[PDB]
Amino acid sequence: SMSVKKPKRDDSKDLALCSMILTEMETHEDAWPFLLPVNLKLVPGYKKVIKKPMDFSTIREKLSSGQYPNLETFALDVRLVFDNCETFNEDDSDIGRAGHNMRKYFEKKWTDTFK
Numbered sequence: 001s002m003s004v005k006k007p008k009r010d011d012s013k014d015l016a017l018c019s020m021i022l023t024e025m026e027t028h029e030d031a032w033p034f035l036l037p038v039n040l041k042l043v044p045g046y047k048k049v050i051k052k053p054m055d056f057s058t059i060r061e062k063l064s065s066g067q068y069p070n071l072e073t074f075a076l077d078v079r080l081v082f083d084n085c086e087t088f089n090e091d092d093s094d095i096g097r098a099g100h101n102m103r104k105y106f107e108k109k110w111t112d113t114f115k
Contacts, residue, residue: 030098
């Protein structure tokens with residue numbers, strides 16, 4: 001509350017560490033469905049159904065340009081990529097499986113880096 005603060009958690013490396021995680025997600029072999037924005041002209045249904053499209057390239061640009069206020073807003077956009085993927089893709093599809101694998105991969109790096 002006013003003039004009463006918990007001890008300061010060191011956040012000065014969060015930017016570099018989120019960039020490293022994002023690099024690792026970018027270079028994973030199952031990243032291919034997620035590297036670029038879904039082409040809303042060419043993929044029927046996507047525009048209407050997925051209210052907030054997100055992809056690794058968009059996260060990378062947001063990261064590079066100071067559009068994440070803190071590490072949690074970064075994790076929200078990563079998770080949004082996977083939540084969108086589950087909304088639109090059957091679990092038993094290559095892209096559906098890619099999404100589950102990438103989410104697992106991300107969540108472990110997140111825990112090992114920050115928890």
